[PDB]
Design a protein around this ligand. Structure first.
Ligand code: VAL
Ligand code: CL
Ligand code: NA
Length: 219
């Protein structure tokens, strides 16, 4: 059973790695967008950047919000009345960070679907010209996880125990206590008890997140 715990520790690391790497490609595009927007933040120039295929193919949309509440999104969408970019999680998140950040799941203003955002402040000579973001669907994150690995299921949880991505969408943004109340596994311990183990995801900007592996205790 030390042998099981090896395998779960080592699958946990291969999944924590494959996912850190999948995200960091995405993070770099958003950072490049913010860097590019900062070159020339005229709205025509911003729009041209957010329209390019590397962005429109990678994300559901990408956008710029600023402190006077200017907003550009591609693909373009009618936003609900008294939408304000500055109250959105991606904005507040990037505004309270000196690097790029990832949101926890929230409700898209654009599609009304459950999404996460990668966001970063666009800075020209120290000064801020706004916050750039890119949206990934909860289903996209469920798919990437399911594609990227053993003998049970992988899920994504914050250090505070908030379930972020779970193939059981009913559990998304439940805590571990609220999701597993009978016997509540702690992220404090490498292993729990259906044996669940937590690997920290190494080298994400701003966030302390884990891969949970959940298995039926067998094979
Ligand atoms: C639409 C976009 C700006 C972002 N997903 C939001 O919900 O605020
Ligand atoms: Cl526009
Ligand atoms: Na590598």
């Amino acid at each position: 059973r030390e042998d099981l715990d090896n395998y779960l520790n080592e699958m946990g690391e291969v999944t924590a790695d494959n996912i850190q790497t999948w995200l960091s490609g995405r993070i770099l595009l958003i950072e490049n967008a913010a860097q590019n927007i900062a070159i020339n933040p005229e709205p025509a120039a911003v729009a041209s950047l957010l329209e390019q295929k590397a962005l429109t193919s990678t994300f559901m949309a990408s956008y710029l919000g600023d402190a006077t509440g200017h907003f550009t999104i591609r693909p373009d969408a009618k936003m609900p009345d008294g939408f304000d970019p500055r109250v959105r999680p991606w904005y507040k998140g990037a505004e309270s960070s000196s690097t790029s950040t990832l949101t926890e799941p929230y409700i898209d203003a654009a599609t009304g679907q459950t999404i996460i955002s990668i966001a970063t402040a666009a800075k020209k000579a120290g000064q801020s010209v706004g916050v750039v973001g890119g949206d990934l669907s909860l289903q996209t994150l469920i798919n990437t996880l399911s594609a990227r690995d053993g003998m049970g299921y992988a899920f994504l949880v914050s250090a505070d125990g908030k379930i972020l991505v779970h193939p059981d969408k009913a559990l998304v943004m439940k805590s571990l206590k609220e999701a597993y109340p009978q016997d509540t596994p702690r992220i404090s311990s490498d292993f729990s008890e259906r044996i669940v183990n937590f690997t920290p995801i190494k080298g994400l900007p701003s966030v302390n997140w884990y891969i949970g592996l959940s298995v039926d205790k067998d094979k």
